[PDB]
Amino acid sequence: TAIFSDRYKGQRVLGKGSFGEVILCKDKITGQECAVKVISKRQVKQKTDKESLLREVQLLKQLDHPNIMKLYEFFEDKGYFYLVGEVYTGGELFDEIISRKRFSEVDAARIIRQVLSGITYMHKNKIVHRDLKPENLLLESKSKDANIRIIDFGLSTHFEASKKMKDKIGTAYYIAPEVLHGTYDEKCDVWSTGVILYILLSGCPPFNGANEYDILKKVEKGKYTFELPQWKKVSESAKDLIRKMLTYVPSMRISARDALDHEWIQTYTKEQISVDVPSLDNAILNIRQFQGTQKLAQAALLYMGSKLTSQDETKELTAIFHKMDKNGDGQLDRAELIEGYKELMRMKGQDASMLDASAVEHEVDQVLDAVDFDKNGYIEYSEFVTVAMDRKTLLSRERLERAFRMFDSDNSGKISSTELATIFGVSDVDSETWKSVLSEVDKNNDGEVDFDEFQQMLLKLCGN
Numbered sequence: 001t002a003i004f005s006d007r008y009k010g011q012r013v014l015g016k017g018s019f020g021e022v023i024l025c026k027d028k029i030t031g032q033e034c035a036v037k038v039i040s041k042r043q044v045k046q047k048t049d050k051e052s053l054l055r056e057v058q059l060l061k062q063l064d065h066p067n068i069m070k071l072y073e074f075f076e077d078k079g080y081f082y083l084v085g086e087v088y089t090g091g092e093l094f095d096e097i098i099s100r101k102r103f104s105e106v107d108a109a110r111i112i113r114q115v116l117s118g119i120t121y122m123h124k125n126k127i128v129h130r131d132l133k134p135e136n137l138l139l140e141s142k143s144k145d146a147n148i149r150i151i152d153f154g155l156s157t158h159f160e161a162s163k164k165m166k167d168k169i170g171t172a173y174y175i176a177p178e179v180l181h182g183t184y185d186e187k188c189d190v191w192s193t194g195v196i197l198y199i200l201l202s203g204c205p206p207f208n209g210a211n212e213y214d215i216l217k218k219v220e221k222g223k224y225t226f227e228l229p230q231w232k233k234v235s236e237s238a239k240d241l242i243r244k245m246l247t248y249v250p251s252m253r254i255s256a257r258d259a260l261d262h263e264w265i266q267t268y269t270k271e272q273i274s275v276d277v278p279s280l281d282n283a284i285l286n287i288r289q290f291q292g293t294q295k296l297a298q299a300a301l302l303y304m305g306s307k308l309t310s311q312d313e314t315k316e317l318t319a320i321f322h323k324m325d326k327n328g329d330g331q332l333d334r335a336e337l338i339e340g341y342k343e344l345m346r347m348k349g350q351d352a353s354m355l356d357a358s359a360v361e362h363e364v365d366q367v368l369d370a371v372d373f374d375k376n377g378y379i380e381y382s383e384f385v386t387v388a389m390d391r392k393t394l395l396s397r398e399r400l401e402r403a404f405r406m407f408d409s410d411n412s413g414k415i416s417s418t419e420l421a422t423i424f425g426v427s428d429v430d431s432e433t434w435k436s437v438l439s440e441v442d443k444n445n446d447g448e449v450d451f452d453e454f455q456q457m458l459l460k461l462c463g464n
């Protein structure tokens with residue numbers, strides 16, 4: 001029976017998505033590139049039986065639509081599921097939108113119709129997304145006219161979502177109230193799209209709050225308004241469609257297919273009237289701020305997670321090498337470093353990157369190539385542990401710095417206390433807890449932090 005790494009080698013990590021890591025992979029015979037989502041059975045519960053999931057996979061492989069991620073293969077072993085799909089290189093939709101000089105109702109209507117078109121297809125095949133949100137909208141290439149490909153259609157029905165805030169951050173804004181209460185059908189995906197439409201035309205979520213529970217509460221009540229200024233530049237036709245997508249009771253809410261037939265869509269995507277239509281400069285400003293904020297809270301949580309993983313892995317790795325070293329010499333040699341590093345993976349797992357014994361050998365060699373002399377030599381294990389673990393983290397430590405640079409749009413070097421309150425609110429860190437931590441790093445501060453102080457705060461929030 002077939003095995004994933006007999007067919008694909010890993011070329012590099014693309015990142016961290018719902019339910020697992022996504023790795024850029026390459027067929028060892030054809031040289032075909034693919035994006036491979038790797039779901040750890042230890043980290044994720046399954047909601048269905050094996051049978052039901054194999055059926056859903058078989059179906060998904062046969063579906064085809066230009067706005068839906070194409071799935072090609074599926075594998076399973078002891079510890080993992082490997083979902084193999086087409087690589088897209090244009091990145092998250094909202095990350096491209098903030099890079100934009102001009103945005104109008106026409107740009108929004110082209111995007112929305114892509115999304116609706118992909119959904120209506122999937123609904124005719126009886127597949128609900130359930131967790132539709134901006135992160136699941138990838139652009140196909142780095143072109144300007146790129147198609148939108150919706151990722152993750154079908155996963156929520158079979159895998160139990162993380163309760164960890166590092167993984168659920170951003171979700172509450174887009175969830176349909178009926179999902180909250182348990183009785184949901186395909187119409188939930190219209191809601192979520194309705195929310196994404198609202199955000200596209202105003203740059204503010206319709207249901208908003210200081211922390212996840214406060215967001216959920218607005219959502220379950222289902223009230224929002226169009227009274228903010230930027231709703232002045234927007235057509236009645238858009239607000240009407242939003243209204244019907246944000247209709248509380250699902251059976252009264254418009255279907256995806258009927259949304260595609262709505263006047264706003266008819267009008268704004270006909271690709272004639274575009275030259276005459278205002279750019280929504282306020283909305284795009286608000287999205288830039290919304291996005292920066294979301295990516296910073298996300299980087300903070302990952303960085304804290306990575307410091308904890310690192311602490312855990314450093315001690316474990318050190319224990320494996322000590323127990324290996326009958327020399328009692330603290331010296332260690334290459335084949336053993338690999339053997340121990342493998343024994344680490346054995347029990348930790350955690351590493352989509354280390355999908356085979358050969359991935360490991362090469363990571364050992366890269367560590368040794370940053371280290372001193374004689375790759376093949378008898379080596380002192382403690383110094384190797386330091387460098388191996390730094391390598392693992394600093395991608396976090398780097399992404400953290402980068403997301404703080406991006407968030408600091410005016411290049412002041414600082415984030416104000418109010419900005420922190422927002423950042424920690426979205427990260428669901430208790431106010432008293434961070435204020436407390438803020439006071440212990442800089443006991444003289446005046447309500448703003450530099451990057452080094454912000455980093456020290458997060459270190460103290462993860463037990464350091």
Ligand SMILES: NC(=O)c1c(-c2cnc3cc(OC4CCC4)ccc3c2)nn(C2CCCCC2)c1N
Pocket residue numbers: 014015016017022035036037060069071083084085086087088089091092138151152153154155
């Ligand atoms: N297809 C790709 O190009 C991907 C993917 C991605 C996302 N979801 C997937 C979901 C997949 O399978 C499930 C869809 C039905 C089963 C298979 C591959 C996937 C790849 N994430 N990513 C990035 C991951 C880091 C965050 C940016 C997106 C890609 N570039």
